[PDB]
Structure formats: C-alpha cells, structure tokens
C-alpha cells in the first residue's frame, strides 16, 4: 500500500498567566523543534538486593522519579 504519514497530533502550551501557544501550527510564531526527551514514560528507579552468597538478586521496590523534559522552540 501507498500512504502519507501525517499524524493528527496537536501540542499546545497554557502559560502561568493563561496565555496560549500552539506549538504545532505556530500562530504565535513559536513551534516545537526537532529534539524532545521526556514525553512518553516518566523515569523510574528500580531497587534490587543481593540474596547473600547465592545466584541473582531480589526486587525491593520501584519509584517514579520527576519528569525532566528537554525540548527546543523555534521562534520566527
């Protein structure tokens, strides 16, 4: 089959004063740039312990960390 991949994805920011930015269409002259880390799953720390002098390790706990999100905006 033949197909253009043009996703429906809309990205908007609402600021601390209630002003808005469309980062997809750029009607405020601002666009999200080609580098994003920290969308999708948040970071997790998983903790394990040694079972004494025996094979492997045992699961203790896991914790979701803060989401550190790194991106750029292109400003015309």
């Amino acid at each position: 089959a033949s197909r253009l991949l043009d996703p429906d994805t809309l990205v908007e920011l609402e600021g601390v004063n209630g002003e808005w930015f469309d980062l997809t269409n750029g009607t405020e002259g601002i666009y999200l740039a080609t580098e994003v880390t920290g969308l999708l799953d948040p970071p997790v720390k998983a903790t394990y312990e040694e079972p004494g002098n025996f094979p492997g390790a045992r699961y203790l706990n896991h914790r979701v960390l803060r989401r550190d999100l790194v991106f750029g905006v292109e400003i015309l």
Binding site: T47, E49, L60, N61
Partner: protein
C-alpha cells in the same frame, strides 16, 4: 538489639547485634557473703587464698 534500616538510596535491611557469653560475668556480683541475706553481710569482704584457678 536489632536495627531495621531504610537508607535514602532505597536499601532496606536488618542488622542484629550480639554480645558474647562472657557478658554473663559482668551481670554477676561477688557478694561479701553469698550464703546470707543482703540485709546482713558479714564478713564484710569475700576473701579467698589459694591456687588462682581454684
């Protein structure tokens, strides 16, 4: 005693601390007269002469 410790990096463990059986001799007192009431202790010192082991 025993400690249950949770560290800031997430390790949880138990530590148990023991004293050797020698510690009994620190919780035993040599009475001036073992055979009498503590209300009446004569002679005033326990004193014994002999070979050190005995």
């Amino acid at each position: 005693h025993y400690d249950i410790v949770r560290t800031k990096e997430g390790d949880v463990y138990m530590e148990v601390v023991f004293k050797h059986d020698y510690e009994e001799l620190k919780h035993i007192y040599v009475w001036a007269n073992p055979f009498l009431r503590p209300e009446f202790q004569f002679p005033k010192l326990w004193v014994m002469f002999g070979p050190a082991k005995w």
